[PDB]
């Protein structure tokens, strides 16, 4: 409920609904047009990409994601799960799910080593950079569920 | 005599072995997503196989600290053959230094008869106040190539 | 709903996975020694492959603490299919308790169309002053069967 | 039902069925073959070996073993009982019963004294080691009903 | 030189030579017949079975074994090496090398966990027991090069 | 096996068989007709009613009841479970399950507190009196799994 | 919260929903059809019968019953309260209230002060015995929340 898996799922549902309204027909006007996202999950298609490093922690995060979607009227048939060896492959794996026209949002869940002993962690910066660029290029929401040790 | 000692060493858990194992799973996973689909009525889980038969690979490795790089290369080749791969379906490319691994990686990845690329190198003196501009470019460059070409690239350098 | 949670769990490093991986390598190693031989002029190294295609297996598992044993069984089956094995070539046998795993193991190993046997069980209260006569018999019995029949038997119980 | 005798009979009955299934002709195939032992005790001939030390306790255990076989469809005519002067003679007598082609399982019932001595009871080890060895040589289940005290 | 790998190899060379003389023709007599083994390794065939657990320690032990044999006139073409996943498989692997009529001795090299927290280590006792029995049954020397942590 | 839950299942299974035998056509005759209940649990649909007071103890009993039915040939799909806030509601819920034409027996599992008071527990008497009365009116066995403490 | 009025009301809530599900359509099948009730009070009509002897204690008890219904999302308009001279009249009064086609549950509250003497065992027994028979005949839950004293 309070785990980072829950939080990532909530952002996905809101964002998916928001993009539905914007592409719809505009209103008559006469007032400021306020746009906002709903928390209803009916009729949506979702995809989750997760890793295996420290599978103890990652396992419970994925459980949270599935619970949140179904509890908000999400049908189990509309979840596609993909597993990758490690964090380095999350962005490339998320590329193929996003391009599919069936999916509406992608949730990325993972975990990264504490590190902090070197000046910079080069490997840990490409996962964040890669996902952000993919969202703008493909015009689809991608959520960052990565925990840090 | 010294040849026997070198051969006696194990090559089951070195960074090269891990890099090749990650490549085989990703290559098989891609061929599954791009193909057909299931019936339905349940959550659909995708996970790659560990079968290396029928897949063609490409390995790019540098030379600086060739004593350490050479064994990392043997680990990767050993993994492919053990898991059923065919020796005839491997391409090895050697480059001078780490600055110019990504340029070679792109040329291999652009071929229509390659499935994954394993990149092997060594980084020297990672703990230094000066920003290692060379080091950050190798990591950044390989990542961008993977997304553009929609082909996995594995990155198994060892710090030093 | 609860079915999804159970399926979401990973089965990559459990004791069952390790037991099945050890069996595949040993079975392939045996088919190499018993066959042909090399030319010579160098030290001859024998090492098994990790290809599970064409091999028939047999798994024996108990019931006490069936909640834990069941997932260990899934790990072993998952390893075989991932490494290229065929689901049709597996035989599962279930037994009441740990005292009588070895008796079932012998019957499977004596078939001419089985290559290795994976044994899965649970041992309870290993730290006790009384000599667990049941526990020592399971370990001793499986070992003797392996040597007599010249066939590998893997032993992947988990203490508790 | 909570006595060790009832437990011993159940184990023997369903291994007798498992072995009958294994050595028979295989099924159609095309899927994983799973083998299990039913609790039907029709046409199964049993033998029981029982000691006499602390004859009071051992007496009720033997009743449980016979009771279980009759309830589960067993014919009373197909049970053979043997009595031995003590624990040490159980392995020797059990082997004599096992070699008979008109037997499908054997149940060993006995009581062992407390091993308060620093050295493990040599007699205690041999009976466990003997019964186990017999099962492998003759390929026939031999259940273990020894109860400590 | 002083590592346990060296010591195991030395015993193998002596034992292999000893069995050569015993099967030879007997002497005239007139005095006590003293038999003893030589340290000459020419013309012999050797086999080594090693594991991978803690491959750092095991690797140097295997290096010692090869050095000792070659330094005593051992040709490199007459060594066969077999690797197994773990300690549990040493006895069964050593079974196949021994039966081959080409080999004259088998050296077993390995390493076992410190343990000592339970009352007994069941897994660590079968490797020792298995190798000893195999030597008597097959009538061939097998050396125990297992280190303990 | 020694828990009251295993005992309750056995009683229910073999009355379900007895009633199936009685209402069927009679035998040839010419001798005394003796009716008995087999332990085969094929094609028998069961219902279980379980309380929640002291949920720890009641939890393991229900596992025994389900375990017994599957071992004796029962299909897991043919069991219906109902949970009630306490002991007082067992008779009322049991009657609802009993009237279904797709049920052949019912098992009542519960725990009752000690009757240390001088007056007998009125709640304790009613559940025994209620379940017994139901069996006669509806002509369907209702096993009694209540365990005192 | 800590008064028997609390518990009686809480139990009634669970039982009301439980019966609604059972009479309704079953589940998708293919597994154990576990049934259970929730604490959703909305949409339910209740009724309370409370005595008048020792109104001091009874008054607070009936107040506790009110708190559950309003607190758990039950309208204050559906509660129906009926008062009677004493404990002897609770059964017959509850029968009339229960038989109404709208009242979906009933609660009883009282104090059996005279239970300290065996002479009251006659009147004491009937009230608990009577309410039990009402529920079975009419097939509708009737909670029993009296206090002994």
Author numbering:
A (entry chain UA), D (entry chain E), E (entry chain B), F (entry chain GC), G (entry chain FC): 14 to 162
B (entry chain TA), C (entry chain A): 3 to 162
What does the paper say about this structure?
While remaining as unassembled fragments in the absence of salt, adding 0.15 M NaCl facilitated cpAaLS(119) tubular formation with ∼92% yield. In the tubular structure, the pentameric building blocks are arranged as a triple-stranded helix, which is unique and has never been seen for any natural or engineered proteins. While the number of pentamer–pentamer contacts remains 0 or 1 without NaCl at pH 8.5, judged by the 2D-averaged cryo-EM images, the mean contact number per pentamer increases to 3, 3.7, and 4 in the tubular, 28 nm-, and 24 nm spherical cages, respectively. In the cpAaLS(119) tubes, the “untethered” α-helix(120–131) binds to the adjacent pentamer surface, which is a solvent-exposed region in wild-type-like assemblies. Because of this non-native interaction, the α-helix(120–131) appears to block 3-fold symmetrical pentamer–pentamer interactions, which explains the uncontacted interfaces observed in the cpAaLS(119) assemblies. Furthermore, substantial cryo-EM density corresponding to the α-helix(120–131) was found only for 2 protomers in each pentamer constituting the tubular assembly, and invisible in the spherical assemblies. In both the straight and twisted tubes, the pentamer–pentamer interaction adopts a wide range of torsion angles: −35°, 18°, and 24° for the straight tube, for example.
